[PDB]
Design a binder for this molecule. Structure first.
Ligand SMILES: *[C@@H]1O[C@H](CO)[C@@H](O[C@@H]2O[C@H](CO)[C@@H](O)[C@H](O)[C@H]2NC(C)=O)[C@H](O)[C@H]1NC(C)=O
Ligand SMILES: *[C@@H]1O[C@H](CO)[C@@H](O)[C@H](O)[C@H]1NC(C)=O
Ligand SMILES: *[C@@H]1O[C@H](CO)[C@@H](O)[C@H](O)[C@H]1NC(C)=O
Ligand SMILES: *[C@@H]1O[C@H](CO)[C@@H](O)[C@H](O)[C@H]1NC(C)=O
Ligand SMILES: *[C@@H]1O[C@H](CO)[C@@H](O)[C@H](O)[C@H]1NC(C)=O
Ligand SMILES: *[C@@H]1O[C@H](CO)[C@@H](O)[C@H](O)[C@H]1NC(C)=O
Ligand SMILES: *[C@@H]1O[C@H](CO)[C@@H](O)[C@H](O)[C@H]1NC(C)=O
Ligand SMILES: *[C@@H]1O[C@H](CO)[C@@H](O)[C@H](O)[C@H]1NC(C)=O
Lengths: 76, 227, 312, 34
């Protein structure tokens, strides 16, 4: 249609708008690019691998659980 | 005990609700069913292919051609359909190999998790595995893995050993935590501080060799009996 | 251990008729072979992506190593990501990537996860295992000094933890020496990375033989469709075109079948790699000879162009 | 390490075990004499 054109390593993507922030991968395109429908229009973005956090490592620091949550998960 | 039982019941109910509500939780069997259906469809669909013949209906070519000429087109159709069936058989063999691998994995999981308590990290679900329950499915098995997930972690400062009477003391089955200003011995996977004593610690060597050793007292349960 | 293979896509119409207007219509008479081949290849590609996701996406959070990289004498410089290189790969990762190296209707589709993201996953796993031991693989990541983590891992092999504290410096020196020698072992060996190179060579050879068979006549007067359509009448050209088409379709189907078998092999390898990750990187394995020869202490994953390398 | 009652446990008399040997086992409470 030519409304919007974006170049990707997998090829030329038309009809999707590239957004400068990352989400979880909904529809995989390739080369780290994924597309999704968000507030509505189809958007293209680099997939996010997950939340980033730094473990408070120290020479004399240890963390110990004071509680527990026994959980049941399903495998098929 | 009561809290653990309540947690287990809530988790079972949550599994029930998730299975009831989730749209595509059982995709690993729907995929097998869909693959079988698609294979049969393409096998039947290939039956309508002409394979270069004038027609795909054998009676038609029989009627509109002489035997000498009909023979070549019938040979073409025979070859096409035989090749289609060969391809179907090969694909079924590959799918059967995949299903055999899946069934071997299922049997191993049943043995390890249901008939025992696997110590493998992710073989019987996320977290420390306690037990599992098998549930029948139309073309597979569903495993409900009960696991122990630690939660509500608190940070403490620790030392590798305790120096008392010029000797290095190590924890027999625990870790040393300081609680800011009071040292205790606690199990790794649950916070249960206890006073450091000769019963829960063992001694090996002097304090000059251990790096990070800290000064603290070790209580002797036999000390009070001075008389 | 290889984890994935090249994602191949083929345009059957172009491969069989080579972009010729004449037999493109004739190829329609043969049915839905093209759809079958396309579906099989798409399934193989999605399976490769799933294999990569399963092997490398076992950690939910991207753990980051602390700035003060002191771990009781242990030196993970060779395995931790480099700060200055644009790829941010580690030394051993750079060496592994350097050691192995690599129309008519056949093309290669890129993987969903790029090398940078696989390196990020490897860095997350390395940070988690270095800073929290086994905890990050079973729930909340709990910090612990590396010396105490190695002491715990010593208890897992039946050796009292005091043996480590009284020999911490020697153990750290041995670890550093072994890590350094790994670089030399990988560089000097002519076939250390033989399996990944074998996968790449198999893919390239399959593509080459598929391309080469276009020149075969298959009993026809010539292998060029334009020639036959130019000097042979339709009644006599049709038989030759059919002779070429059947052979080319058979070649493509053989390629697809071999690709399916090799993809099953790659899936087995990827499942083994995922199990190895879970049981050696995210925990300590009591299984004999499953995470290296000897009593397993811990393992480190390293990214490779088409697989994973475990430093047991 | 020295053989003591802390690192050893008793099970029956010593006429039922093949290869048993005669040796002393030290009791840490014996010299304490509480
Ligand atoms: C245990 O083995 C290690 C490794 O061979 C020994 O450490 C070496 O000891 C020699 C002699 O003192 C030194 O020249 C080397 O530099 C040491 N190597 C390292 C990596 O430190 C250690 O001495 C041995 N211990 C015992 C009790 O035999
Ligand atoms: C995305 O953000 C970065 C950092 O602000 C900027 O350099 C880049 O130009 C932005 N790209 C687009 C397409 O907005
Ligand atoms: C450690 O715990 C103290 C209180 O016990 C808290 O103030 C501090 O923020 C904690 N630090 C980390 C890194 O968790
Ligand atoms: C643990 O620390 C708190 C504050 O540092 C202190 O009030 C408390 O007494 C300590 N625990 C014990 C058993 O003394
Ligand atoms: C590491 O912690 C231990 C225990 O608190 C302490 O004895 C040692 O001095 C510390 N080392 C450094 C370099 O801070
Ligand atoms: C521990 O106490 C002893 C005396 O009982 C002393 O000689 C030693 O220096 C102390 N260690 C530290 C780290 O303060
Ligand atoms: C770690 O090892 C590398 C390679 O031997 C060396 O260049 C680096 O200085 C070492 N780091 C430390 C802190 O010793
Ligand atoms: C061990 O000692 C007991 C009691 O002194 C004695 O009866 C027995 O013969 C001894 N056995 C050996 C093998 O010396």
């Amino acid at each position: 249609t030519g409304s919007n054109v974006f170049q990707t390593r997998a090829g030329c993507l038309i009809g999707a708008e590239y957004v400068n922030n990352s989400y979880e991968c909904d529809i995989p395109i390739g080369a780290g690019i994924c597309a999704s429908y968000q507030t509505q229009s189809i958007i293209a973005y680099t997939m996010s691998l997950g939340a980033e956090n730094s473990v408070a490592y120290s020479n004399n620091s240890i963390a110990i659980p004071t509680n527990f949550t026994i959980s049941v998960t399903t495998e098929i | 005990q009561k809290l653990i039982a309540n947690q287990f019941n809530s988790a079972i109910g949550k599994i029930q609700d998730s299975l009831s509500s989730t749209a595509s939780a059982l995709g690993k069997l729907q995929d097998v069913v869909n693959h079988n259906a698609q294979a049969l469809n393409t096998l039947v669909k290939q039956l309508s292919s002409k394979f270069g013949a004038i027609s795909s209906v054998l009676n038609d070519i029989f009627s509109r051609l002489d035997p000498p000429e009909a023979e070549v087109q019938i040979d073409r159709l025979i070859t096409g359909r035989l090749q289609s069936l060969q391809t179907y058989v090969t694909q079924q063999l590959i799918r059967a190999a995949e299903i055999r691998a899946s069934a071997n994995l299922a049997a191993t999981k049943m043995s390890e998790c249901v008939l025992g308590q696997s110590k493998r990290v992710d073989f019987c679900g996320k977290g420390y595995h306690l037990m599992s329950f098998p549930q029948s499915a139309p073309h597979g098995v569903v495993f409900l893995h009960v696991t122990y997930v630690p939660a509500q972690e608190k940070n403490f400062t620790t030392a590798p050993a305790i120096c008392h009477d010029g000797k290095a003391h190590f924890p027999r089955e625990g870790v040393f935590v300081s609680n800011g200003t009071h040292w205790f011995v606690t199990q790794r996977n649950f916070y249960e501080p206890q006073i450091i004593t000769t019963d829960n610690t063992f001694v090996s060597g002097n304090c000059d060799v251990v790096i990070g050793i800290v000064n603290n007292t070790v209580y002797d349960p036999l000390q009070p009996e001075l008389d | 251990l290889p984890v994935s293979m090249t994602k191949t896509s083929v345009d059957c119409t172009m491969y069989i008729c080579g972009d010729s207007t004449e037999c493109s219509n004739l190829l329609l008479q043969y049915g839905s072979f093209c759809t079958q081949l396309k579906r099989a290849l798409t399934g193989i590609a999605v399976e490769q992506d799933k294999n990569t996701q399963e092997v490398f996406a076992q950690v939910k959070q991207i753990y980051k190593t602390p700035p003060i990289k002191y771990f009781g004498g242990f030196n993970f410089s060779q395995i931790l990501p480099d700060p200055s290189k644009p790829s941010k790969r580690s030394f051993i990762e750079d060496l592994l990537f350097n050691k192995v190296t690599l129309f008519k209707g056949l093309t290669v589709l890129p993987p969903l996860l790029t090398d940078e993201m696989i390196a990020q996953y490897t860095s997350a796993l390395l940070a988690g295992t270095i800073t929290s031991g086994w905890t990050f693989g079973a729930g909340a990541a709990l910090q612990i000094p590396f010396a105490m983590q190695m002491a715990y891992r010593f208890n897992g092999i039946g050796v009292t933890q005091n043996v480590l504290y009284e020999n911490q410096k020697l153990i750290a020196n041995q670890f550093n020496s072994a890590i350094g020698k790994i670089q030399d072992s990988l560089s000097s060996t002519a076939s250390a990375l033989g399996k990944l190179q074998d996968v790449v060579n198999h893919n390239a050879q399959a593509l080459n033989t598929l391309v080469k068979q276009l020149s075969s006549k298959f009993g026809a007067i010539s292998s060029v469709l334009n020639d036959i359509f130019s000097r042979l009448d339709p009644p006599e050209a049709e038989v030759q075109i059919d002779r070429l088409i059947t052979g080319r379709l058979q070649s493509l189907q053989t390629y697809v079948t071999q690709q399916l078998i090799r993809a099953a092999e790659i899936r087995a390898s990827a499942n083994l790699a995922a199990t190895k990750m879970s049981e050696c990187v995210l925990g300590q394995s009591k299984r004999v000879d499953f995470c290296g020869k000897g009593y397993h202490l811990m393992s480190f994953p390293q990214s490779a162009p088409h697989g994973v390398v475990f430093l047991h």
